[PDB]
């Protein structure tokens, strides 16, 4: 849903060498937190997607904390993302240079 920026009011996608310097683990809130790392030539809104695909073809989850620019070429913002109950993949970027990671989220009858 809202896990791609925000349509025709935000800017692109970093595709230079992207991690996780924190992967996306569940914080028992409905929510998985991680911290993610921009090295060189990539001027970007912050890409971190929550998708039916390993590759983030679909854009399945929402945002809960802010999506700002990287601040330098070495920048690395925080972030928490809400899949739905069931099944995610977390991908952090765009192009070749984007991580996956897999995520399960309990059912909406224990909220957490």
Do not use: W
């Given at each position: ?21 924190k992967?996306p683990?569940?914080?028992?809130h ?12 990539a001027?970007?809104k ?10 983030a073809?679909?854009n ?5 904390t ?7 070429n ?6 928490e ?6 099944d ?7 192009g ?7 995520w399960?989220k309990?059912?909406s009858?224990?909220?957490?």
């Open positions: 849903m809202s896990a791609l920026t925000l349509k025709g009011t935000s800017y692109k996608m970093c595709t230079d060498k992207m991690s996780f310097v992967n683990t569940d914080t028992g409905g929510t998985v937190v991680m911290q993610v790392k921009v090295p060189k030539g001027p970007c912050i890409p971190v997607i929550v998708a039916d695909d390993l590759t073809a679909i399945k989850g929402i945002l809960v802010v999506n700002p620019i990287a601040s330098t070495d920048d690395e913002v925080l972030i993302v809400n899949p739905p109950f069931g995610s993949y977390i991908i952090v970027g765009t070749d240079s984007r991580l996956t990671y897999q399960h309990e059912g009858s224990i909220g957490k």
